[PDB]
Amino acid sequence: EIKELLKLGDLPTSGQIRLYDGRTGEQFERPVTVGYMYMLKLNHLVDDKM
Amino acid sequence: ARVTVQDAVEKIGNRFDLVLVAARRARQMQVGGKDPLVPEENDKTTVIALREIEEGLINNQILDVRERQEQQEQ
Amino acid sequence: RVDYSGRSVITVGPYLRLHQCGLPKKMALELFKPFIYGKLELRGLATTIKAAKKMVEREEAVVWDILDEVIREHPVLLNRAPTLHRLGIQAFEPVLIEGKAIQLHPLVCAAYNADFDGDQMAVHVPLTLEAQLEARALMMSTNNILSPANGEPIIVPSQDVVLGLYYMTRDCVNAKGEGMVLTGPKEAERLYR
Amino acid sequence: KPLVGTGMERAVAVDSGVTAVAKRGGVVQYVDASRIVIKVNEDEMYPGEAGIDIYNLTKYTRSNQNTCINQMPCVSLGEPVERGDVLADGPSTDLGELAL
Amino acid sequence: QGSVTEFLKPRLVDIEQVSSTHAKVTLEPLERGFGHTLGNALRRILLSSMPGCAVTEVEIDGVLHEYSTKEGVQEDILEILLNLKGLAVRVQGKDEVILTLNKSGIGPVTAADITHDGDVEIVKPQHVICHLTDENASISMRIKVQRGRGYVPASTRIHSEEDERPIGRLLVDACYSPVERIAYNVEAARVEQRTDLDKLVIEMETNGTIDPEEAIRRAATILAEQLEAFVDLRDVRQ
Amino acid sequence: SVTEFLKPRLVDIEQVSSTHAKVTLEPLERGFGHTLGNALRRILLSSMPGCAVTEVEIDGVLHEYSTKEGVQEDILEILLNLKGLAVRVQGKDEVILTLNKSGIGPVTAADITHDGDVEIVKPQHVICHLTDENASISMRIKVQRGRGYVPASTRIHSEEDERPIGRLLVDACYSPVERIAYNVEAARVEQRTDLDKLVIEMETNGTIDPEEAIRRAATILAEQLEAFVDLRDVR
To answer: Is-contact E182 E202, C-beta < 8 A?
Structure first.
């Protein structure tokens, strides 16, 4: 169902999109896995630690 | 910048007192009263002292004869 | 409790030299204040010690230049708090990087055993001849390679170096290019073209 | 709100007491960041004292972790409110759904 | 020995856009080797180098500090300053051109509530700022928008103005980046004239501030003006 | 401060003979590091005007593969030594030279017949070593002016002429460059946080000053965009 929904979202079913370098502009070999995940900000910032 | 001290070790291997010798030359140039004998890469007088040891014309005997020469001439 | 400590958190510089420090500008000039006062003294940009203190407290842009003149060859020794072996403390040549952290050489990170999970970092400033120059002629990370435990030189070119060199050296049947008559400079034109 | 989730945090955010909920919901009259008031519907009311239910939102306030807490209105105005609906969101909460 | 000369005229005339933010810029002629380098390099020159005008700071009477909130608003001053930061405006004559607004009523205020001045461009007539609950709620504030180049955080501004400044001034960051994102097409062009020629078209999403031809033009002037120092070399005569 | 940007001026330059190119460009604004080396690398590397050997003719068997002949060297290695030679050609597009040897010794390109419009870069170019006895060599070499690198996979090979089996012709390298590389480093100026720093390391085969070829590529790029910026700048 994950690949069915992601395939319904017009995105490539394998979850890999051809990507180009932002620096040199050249293409990276082979498809690359990308996505959107939930991240976390903590109290470990180095103004408080350092 | 000096790649590795092992070249000066090839000059005279000690590694125990090279801290005191190079610290004595870099002390003479750091406190003042001494001039660099090597063209500068912008490296400070300490690395200039490392390249001075790598030159081969600075050693224990050179610091003793030169130190007594400056003490006798002063 | 020692003295002169940034107490930073490790970041990984891939670039610059195996022995060098992505010491940051914020950790800089805080512990270098004596060298800045003596610098303005010998150079003569200031007048009195109090005037130099004013120049530093005002955070002038001119202090940054001579500050760089000091930082380049003035080394910084580094250690992780849970220290085990002799290579835990190593001398690097600091260069300023914008940020609150220290960019550290990853091949040296395996020597420290330190991890990027957020473990703390103790940053000390050596004092003059015996410390700076002793750590320059002894405790440097390139000057000390062999480990007097296993006896083999301890270097960990793992992770993307093993994977990257694995993808570098390998063969494939058919694909494109077949053979090539060009020999020495085939990577520039052949690869990049 | 997390685009990947469970659906337990919907009950955790409202059952944590952090968000500002509404008792005997009704047609909202006046809104503000400091205070929120609601006109209670005539379906279920007490015969004595009449009146409507008023709420005082807490502003930015220090916590024990030295963090920032506050509640923000999720409704515009004139919107019917049921019993148990969350009017305002606490810290790290979006529309009664926990996002930290 | 070949075509000779250089592939001049890149062109860019006859651009076409579907909306104000979106853009399509067609470069029909190219050399066989200039196809990817001009688009992929020119987009980096355009993002890394570009003028822009974004909301600088907001001074409102009824709010003493950023964390305080006026009575009768549904959003706090942090969110209000975020929505005000979301505005995109261009100016011609001067770099500041301060503005002010006030209203008493019930509802969300449109971005056109700003008093019209000599140079004013509003690309977002449907934009929403704060809210007005009910009864009598009157908002009055003065927004100052200063022209900028890169991203200026509020820390640099409080560092420059840290010597003296009145209380009540609301400082926010400025992106000063009117062009949101750039895309292009690498497809080759088939012209019934000669050999092969490559074309590249740019779909560019901006804030609706500076024209696409002006963006590509200024980027080209920055690149060529950067090469002007490379045309000549110091010492190196014999 | 305003819309204009910084103008760098290089105080340093480094080279070793004609075969090494070391250039340092600092300071550069954020985002300008990879554009400069990317355009100079992909343009200067791929397309430059030059001269290269279009074909070579060897006495004896006209086919590519051959044995014995007393050449002391494999024909592909002779062709490699011929492709490792840089030739300066005047306004003429195509020109043909020849190679004939006798005696005992190495074969130096300086012994090739001298033409007024053809210039050789080095006398020390060695096509092949001493052949046994005399064994007079007969070679008819033809060179042309291209822009690119001539691939060996796709060619016409004159259909049914010196076409042989496959391949055909002689690989030709137009652009007179060997290696091109660049690095991006951090550079600080006054209160600036991070700035780009460009490092151009380019090894050149010869016959052209590497930096002069760099400004050449600048004239090809600025020559392609010059009519685009023509309406941009009034003067």
So the answer is: yes
The answer to whether A20 contacts chain F (CB < 8 Å) is no
Say yes or no for a CB contact (<8 Å) between D3 and A43.
no
Chain A residues touching D65 at Cβ < 8 A: 43
Domain end call among E176, E197, E225 = E176
Residue of E nearest to A25 (CA): E40
Say yes or no: E138 and E149 in one domain: yes
Does A25 contact F at CB distance below 8 Å? yes
Q: From the CB coordinates, do chains A and C have 3 or more pairs under 8 Å?
A: yes
* Contact between A46 and C100 using a beta-carbon 8 Å cutoff: yes
Half-sphere exposure of F12 (CA within 13 A, CB side): 11
Kindly report the CATH number assigned to the domain that includes residue F45. 3.30.1360.10
Buried b (16+ CB within 10 A) or exposed e, D24-59: bbbebeebbbeebebebeeeeeeeeeeeeeebebee
E36 CB within 8 Å of a chain A CB: yes
Task: Give the residue numbers in A contacting C (CB under 8 Å), as ranges.
Answer: 44, 46-47, 49-50
Domains and CATH numbers, chain B: 1-74 (3.90.940.10)
Strand partners, F104: none
Asked how this structure was determined, the answer is cryo-EM
How many domains, chain F? 2
Length of chain D: 100
The verdict on F168 and F179 lying in the same domain is: no
CB E41 within 8 A of CB E135: no
**Does E31 sit within 8 Å of F225, measured CB to CB?**
no
The neighbouring-strand residues paired with D37 are: D54
Calpha distance B55→B52 (Å, rounded): 5
Determine the Cα–Cα distance for residues B7 and F180; give it in Å rounded to an integer: 32
Instruction: Assess whether F56 and F126 both reside in one domain.
Output: yes
Backbone angles phi, psi at D27, to 5 degrees: -80, 120
Q: Is E135 left (phi over 0), alpha (psi -120 to 50) or beta?
A: left
Backbone angles phi, psi at C119, to 5 degrees: -55, 145
Query: If we measure between CA atoms, which residue out of E190, E186, E215, E91 comes closest to residue E144?
Result: E91
Q: List the subunits that have 3+ CB pairs under 8 angstroms with C.
A: A, B, F
At position E83, the amino acid (one-letter code) is N
Residue B12: CB partners within 8 Å, gap ≥ 6?
Answer: B59
Annotation: binding site of C for Mg(2+): 115, 117, 119
**Are E157 and E171 found together in one domain?**
yes
| C-alpha closest to that of F53 among F132, F4, F125 | F125
Q: Within an 8 Å CB–CB cutoff, is residue C9 touching chain F?
A: no
Q: Chain C within 8 Å of B61 (Cβ-Cβ)? A: no
Q: Do chains E and B touch (3 or more CB pairs under 8 A)?
A: no
Mutate to test the interface with E, among D77, D79, D87 (most CBs of E within 10 A): D77
Q: Do A36 and D3 touch (CB under 8 A)?
A: yes
- Give me the half-sphere count of Cα atoms (radius 13 Å) on the Cβ side of residue C140: 24
CB distance D30–E133 less than 8 Å?
A: yes
* Same domain, residue pair F93 and F81: yes
Asked if residue F60 and residue F132 are part of one domain, the reply reads yes
F206: DSSP letter:
S
Per-residue tokens: F86: 């840089």
Q: Are residues F98 and F27 in the same domain?
A: no
Q: Given CB atoms, is A30 within the 8 Å cutoff of chain D?
A: no
Range of the domain at E115: 52-176
Domain boundary among E144, E176, E208: E176
The CATH number given to whatever domain includes residue F100 is 2.170.120.12
CATH number of D18-92, picked from 3.50.50.60, 3.10.530.10, 2.40.50.100, 1.10.287.470: 2.40.50.100
| One domain, residues F69 and F127 | yes
